[PDB]
């Protein structure tokens, strides 16, 4: 009717939120513009071993640069991704303010934290510094694209072993993610935790 969840995607302007949600090609083709709220809702369908799951992802039209988001933006949000930019420290320092802002209005919805732009070698916010699951991502290479959504699916459904059996069509990568860098970053996280 179906199995559908509103997901709010928040975090400073310029962190890559729009870029990230647009990797899902069908959700971009089927996006709905919400005139009264300045939002595009992207219906992202994923396919698990137990069937389809739909995340309706709310992406701002950039107003987080100029002020706070309306309440209507947060109404009936059932999960969230907070994004930051791994090359801009201010964006990471605001994460607790995005986190509180969400909490104040939600609350105890599952939240994933994503550090975007890990494709850039010149990284400022490293693992040492970093239900609040973390992933390194690179929107422009699709690196770790599935992970936030898989983790949120496993948390929402209550199945720790849920898997995506088929990947959605994703925008061709516009940037490369060096797999050896990805392994070094994986190791840094393991040596933080």
């Amino acid at each position: 009717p179906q199995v559908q969840f509103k997901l709010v995607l928040v975090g400073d302007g310029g962190t890559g939120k729009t870029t990230f949600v647009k990797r899902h090609l069908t959700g971009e083709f089927e996006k709905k513009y919400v005139a009264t709220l300045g939002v595009e809702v992207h219906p992202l369908v994923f396919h698990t071993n137990r069937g389809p799951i739909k995340f309706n992802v709310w992406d701002t039209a950039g107003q987080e640069k100029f002020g706070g988001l309306r309440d209507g933006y947060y109404i009936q949000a059932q999960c969230a991704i907070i994004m930051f930019d791994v090359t801009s420290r201010v964006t990471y320092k605001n994460v607790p303010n995005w986190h509180r802002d969400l909490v104040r209005v939600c609350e105890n919805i599952p939240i994933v934290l994503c550090g975007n732009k890990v494709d850039i070698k010149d990284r400022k916010v490293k693992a040492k510094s970093i239900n609040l699951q973390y992933y390194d991502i690179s929107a422009k290479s699709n690196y770790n694209f599935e992970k936030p959504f898989l983790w949120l699916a496993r948390k929402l459904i209550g199945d720790p072993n849920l898997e995506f059996v088929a990947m959605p069509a994703l925008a061709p990568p516009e940037v490369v993610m060096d797999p050896a860098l990805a392994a070094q970053y994986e190791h840094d996280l393991e040596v933080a935790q």
Partner: protein, 37 residues
């Protein structure tokens, strides 16, 4: 095979604008204020 037991209350309707799920008594969408068709 979910959702069992993830289905909405009877008469829940999805907003064609946003597409929040609204209570059967809702005349407007709770999030975006678009009236029920």
């Amino acid at each position: 095979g979910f959702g069992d037991k993830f289905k909405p209350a009877i008469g829940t309707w999805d907003c064609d604008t946003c597409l929040v799920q609204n209570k059967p008594e809702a005349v407007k969408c709770v999030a975006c204020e678009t009236p029920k068709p």
